[PDB]
């Protein structure tokens, strides 16, 4: 528990301790899918609440 | 302590008088069996000499 509590703080985290590739530790695809879903459903609620119009929504979706 | 010590001790029943020193009424037969059981070695011969 005490080691888990220091890992929350950002301790025992550094280059010496790590023994796996960045992908092995946190996959790049997961980082994309978290990110891309978050950018998606931001643009969903802006469209339906009506800050943004539907024409600009369609451009930003593909960007 | 003394309340317990005077409570705990015993009358000594009749069974202690007759079966204190005594043991082994009906002795253990040679196979090591119960009263109704059968033992096919020694069903045939009756008697300890034979």
């Amino acid at each position: 528990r005490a080691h888990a509590q220091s890992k929350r703080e950002g301790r025992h985290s550094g280059y010496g301790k790590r023994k796996g590739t960045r992908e092995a530790r946190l996959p790049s695809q997961v980082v994309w899918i978290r990110r891309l879903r978050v950018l998606r459903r931001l643009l969903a609620k802006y469209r339906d609440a009506g800050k943004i119009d539907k024409h600009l929504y369609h451009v930003l979706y593909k960007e | 302590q003394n309340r317990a010590a005077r409570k705990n001790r015993y009358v000594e029943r009749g069974s202690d008088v007759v079966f204190g020193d005594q043991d082994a009424l009906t002795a253990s037969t040679e196979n090591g069996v119960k009263l109704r059981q059968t033992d096919r070695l020694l069903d045939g011969v009756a008697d300890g000499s034979m």
Binding site: - | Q1, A4, A5, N8, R9
Partner: protein, 106 residues
């Protein structure tokens, strides 16, 4: 809002024998109990009050029955009274110190 919680420790069978005393126990509790950090803060969050037969503690603040059991066994080890006395619950928030089994010598 806060809602107080009475806790009642009997100490009859220890005290009549005279290995144990309520007065030192009620003295030991009232300083060593902790609220919101550290010891010796407790004005009106709690009120430790011995009768003689039964000790009573009532807590509007954060306090639990396990923490009362904790501080008693802490006190009992201080007197070398663990191995011969134990903290027991008879009913909910209703506790009492009972001697272990102990056979007679004869």
């Amino acid at each position: 809002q806060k809602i107080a919680k009475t806790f009642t420790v009997d100490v009859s069978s220890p005290t009549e024998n005279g290995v144990f005393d309520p007065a030192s126990y009620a003295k030991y509790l009232i300083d060593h109990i902790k609220v919101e950090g550290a010891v010796g803060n407790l004005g009106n969050a709690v009120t430790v009050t011995e009768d003689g037969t039964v000790v009573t503690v009532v807590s509007t603040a954060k306090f639990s029955g396990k923490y009362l059991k904790y501080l008693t066994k802490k006190y009992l080890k201080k007197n070398q009274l663990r191995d011969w006395i134990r903290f027991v619950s008879t009913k909910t928030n209703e506790y009492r110190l009972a001697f272990y089994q102990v056979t007679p010598e004869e």
